[PDB]
């Protein structure tokens, strides 16, 4: 696969998408510096519309923990009916 191919499902929990993005990026053949740039751009870029809105709002200084918290329940809540 390619990191370029990883995108958040329409209703996928942000936490699940980040996990998939990380797993793919670990395997990607690129420089560390490039992997940093990929994370800094593609993770938010390829989030679904509803998460993407939240992530942009949080700003570039946000931590992963903060992103996770802000996107909790978007697409969800995902409990059995």
């Amino acid at each position: 696969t390619s990191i370029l191919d990883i995108r958040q499902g329409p209703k996928e929990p942000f936490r699940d998408y980040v996990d998939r993005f990380y797993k793919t990026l670990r395997a990607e053949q690129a420089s560390q510096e490039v992997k940093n740039w990929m994370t800094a751009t593609l993770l938010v870029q390829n989030a679904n519309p509803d998460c993407k809105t939240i992530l942009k709002a949080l700003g570039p200084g946000a931590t992963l923990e903060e992103m996770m918290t802000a996107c909790q329940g978007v697409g969800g809540p995902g409990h059995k009916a």
Partner: peptide
């Protein structure tokens, strides 16, 4: 965030 943040989070 950077790849290093991912490594820290999941590592």
């Amino acid at each position: 965030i950077t790849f290093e943040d991912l490594l820290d989070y999941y590592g």
